[PDB]
Amino acid sequence: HTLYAPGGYDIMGYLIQIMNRPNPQVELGPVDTSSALILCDLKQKDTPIVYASEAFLYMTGYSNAEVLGRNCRFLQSPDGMVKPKSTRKYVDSNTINTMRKAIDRNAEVQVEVVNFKKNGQRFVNFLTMIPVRDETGEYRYSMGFQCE
Ligand SMILES: Cc1cc2nc3c(=O)[nH]c(=O)nc-3n(C[C@H](O)[C@H](O)[C@H](O)COP(=O)(O)OP(=O)(O)OC[C@H]3O[C@@H](n4cnc5c(N)ncnc54)[C@H](O)[C@@H]3O)c2cc1C
């Protein structure tokens, strides 16, 4: 039962924040909303997607209604059914654990993970996740950049 900020999210402000961060642990280069990206809420149950760019929806074949409010791990199965803590049968366990720990620590991370589109099409996702600070100054969200 994820809640969404009425009035939307400051996606542009966050992209600006990310490109201006002082100690980047991963180079991303210039980024904008023309690419596949998602913002998840670190402070809500199971760090749910609260925003997805059209590029992301087009890439994965899923609609807004189908991704919002869910933890993005569903992409790890061709049937979009992935329970938390479960042992994936098509994805590297170490990879999933790497994402998990980085996110838990607000640490930037970049990985290549196997994902599946809504029609079951397998693909390699070059994923980068960067923690984002909201108006309070503390990390509240995480922005993911997906690349096929
Ligand atoms: C902004 C954002 C964008 C994201 N975008 C994507 C995306 O496009 N595609 C995608 O696939 N994911 C994406 N993710 C990742 C996904 O939402 C989860 O964060 C990720 O799957 C790891 O968390 P989890 O809760 O699924 O971990 P878990 O369900 O807990 O799974 C961890 C797995 O690692 C193994 N494991 C755990 N600990 C150890 C250990 N000590 N030794 C060995 N094995 C271990 C387990 O067997 C387990 O199956 C994104 C996350 C964020 C925050």
From TrEMBL:
Annotated keywords: Activator, Chromophore, DNA-binding, FAD, Flavoprotein, FMN, Metal-binding, Nucleotide-binding, Photoreceptor protein, Receptor, Repeat, Sensory transduction, Transcription, Transcription regulation, Zinc, Zinc-finger
GO cellular component, one term: nucleus
Binding positions (FMN): 71, 73, 76, 88, 100, 115, 125, 146
Limits of the PAS domain: 49-106
GO molecular function term, any single one: nucleotide binding
Amino-acid positions noted as binding FAD in the UniProt annotation, renumbered to this chain: 71-73, 76, 85-86, 88, 97, 100, 115, 125, 146
Annotated positions of the Cysteine sulfenic acid (-SOH) modification: 35
Protein name according to UniProt: Vivid PAS protein VVD
